[PDB]
Design a protein around this ligand. Structure first.
Ligand SMILES: CCN1/C(=C/C(C)=O)Sc2ccc(OC)cc21
Length: 336
């Protein structure tokens, strides 16, 4: 498949002693290494497949990662640090700071039982800070999701949930980092027509009306919801169904966006061409509901969170909350 074959103990660059495999994917593999040129510091080495397209994609990430480091010498940006990069016999290798499991991995290991609201607040704040940094530097991440947000340390402690009568895993530290900048696009760069993983895709991306920074905010909205409930907001792999789910959860699509889109097969009489009476329409009715019906409590802090999610899930990209605004939200008031 083009993967680099390696054994526990191998030395790349005569520098990186392989300890274990941290991750795996279609990009390649991530390996924990002892960096003998950095005092024996444990690093995370992303080894990209020996494949033309993935190599060219890795170089674009390296370009973003170099801009990330440049514009953040003190490492306050909450984006993953690249310490080194090199070309190893066709394999692009990137040396990262060692982190923990993804916020998805942790949620999954916790039976998809949601994060506590106080942890959601700290996770959401850091997410907004990290992407705002990118937004300030003329960048859009495009591929934001629980998998691309990692805990710095994913060590947990067992905590009883008196309500659900179950034991829950609670991460000791909620410090997170944003990873995977392979899709990151500069303002001047060639924008792809379709971006984001399905579940976190903004409606302007679906309707192909052009996209920039606002589409990241839409993703962050979905992610934060997922942190609060446990399951993904839009569970679908179909455009027309996705748009129907959007309408049920958030209300009608703005008339201007229907008017402007070329995706006119999805629309009839200036409204969404969706029949709720079908078995597909009934499925949408029984698998999702208006956004605020997902509240686990009526306490003020829970309502403030959904004020934030709702503002982030504004249909119109230009009318959508910016991340500079997001950090000023009443929901983040009780943080140091
Ligand atoms: C496998 C997750 N992962 C990355 C993934 C991608 C696609 O970039 S980048 C990364 C860096 C450190 C780490 O520590 C454990 C993990 C890590």
């Amino acid at each position: 498949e083009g993967h680099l074959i390696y054994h526990v103990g191998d030395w790349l660059q005569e520098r990186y002693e392989i300890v274990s495999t941290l991750g795996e994917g279609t990009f390649g593999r991530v390996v924990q290494c002892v960096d003998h040129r950095r005092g024996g510091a444990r690093v995370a080495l992303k080894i990209i497949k020996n494949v033309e397209k993935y190599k060219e994609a890795a170089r674009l990430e390296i370009n973003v990662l170099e801009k990330i480091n440049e514009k953040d010498p003190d490492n306050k940006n909450l984006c993953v640090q690249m310490f080194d990069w090199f070309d190893y016999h066709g394999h692009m290798c990137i040396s990262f700071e060692l982190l923990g499991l993804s916020t998805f991995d942790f949620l999954k290991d916790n039976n998809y039982l949601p994060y506590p609201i106080h942890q959601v607040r700290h996770m959401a704040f850091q997410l907004c800070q990290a992407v705002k940094f990118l937004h300030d530097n003329k960048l859009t991440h495009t591929d934001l999701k629980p998998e691309n947000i990692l805990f710095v340390n994913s060590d947990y402690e067992l905590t009883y949930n008196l309500e659900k009568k179950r034991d829950e895993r609670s991460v000791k530290s909620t410090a997170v980092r944003v990873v995977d900048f392979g899709s990151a696009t500069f303002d001047h760069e060639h924008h792809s027509t379709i971006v984001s993983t399905r579940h976190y895709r903004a409606p302007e991306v679906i309707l192909e009306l052009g996209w920039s920074q606002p589409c990241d905010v839409w993703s962050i909205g979905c992610i934060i919801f997922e942190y609060y409930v446990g399951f993904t907001l839009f569970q679908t792999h179909d455009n027309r169904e996705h748009l129907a789910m959007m309408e049920r959860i958030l209300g009608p699509i703005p008339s201007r966006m229907i008017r402007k889109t070329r995706k006119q097969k999805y629309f009839y009489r200036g409204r969404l061409d969706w029949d709720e009476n079908t078995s597909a329409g009934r499925y949408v009715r029984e698998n999702c509901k208006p956004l605020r019906r997902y509240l686990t409590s009526e306490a003020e802090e829970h309502h403030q969170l959904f004020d934030l999610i709702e503002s982030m899930l504004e249909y119109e990209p230009a009318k959508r909350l910016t991340l500079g605004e997001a950090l000023q939200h009443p929901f983040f008031a009780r943080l140091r």
